[PDB]
Short mmCIF file of C-alpha atoms (C1' of nucleotides) in Angstrom, two decimals:
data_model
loop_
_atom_site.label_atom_id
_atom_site.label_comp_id
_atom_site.label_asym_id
_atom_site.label_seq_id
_atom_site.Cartn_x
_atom_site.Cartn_y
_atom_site.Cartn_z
CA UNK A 1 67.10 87.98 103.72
CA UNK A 2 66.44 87.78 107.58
CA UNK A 3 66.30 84.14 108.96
CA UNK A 4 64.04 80.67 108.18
CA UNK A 5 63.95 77.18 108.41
"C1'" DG B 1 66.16 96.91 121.14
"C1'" DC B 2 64.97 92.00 122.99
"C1'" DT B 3 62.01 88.58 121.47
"C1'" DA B 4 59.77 85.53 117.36
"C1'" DC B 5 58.55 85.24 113.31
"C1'" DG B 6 60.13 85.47 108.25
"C1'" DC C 1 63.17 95.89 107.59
"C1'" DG C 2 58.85 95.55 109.68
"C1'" DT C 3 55.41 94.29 112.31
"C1'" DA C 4 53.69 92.93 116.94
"C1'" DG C 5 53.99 92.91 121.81
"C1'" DC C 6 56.42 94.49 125.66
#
DNA sequence: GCTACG
DNA sequence: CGTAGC
């Protein structure tokens, strides 16, 4: 799931 | 696609 | 992917 803090 | 977010 | 800005 893609990229975040 | 690289960037930047998300 | 997925949208946006280039």
């Amino acid at each position: 799931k893609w990229k975040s803090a």
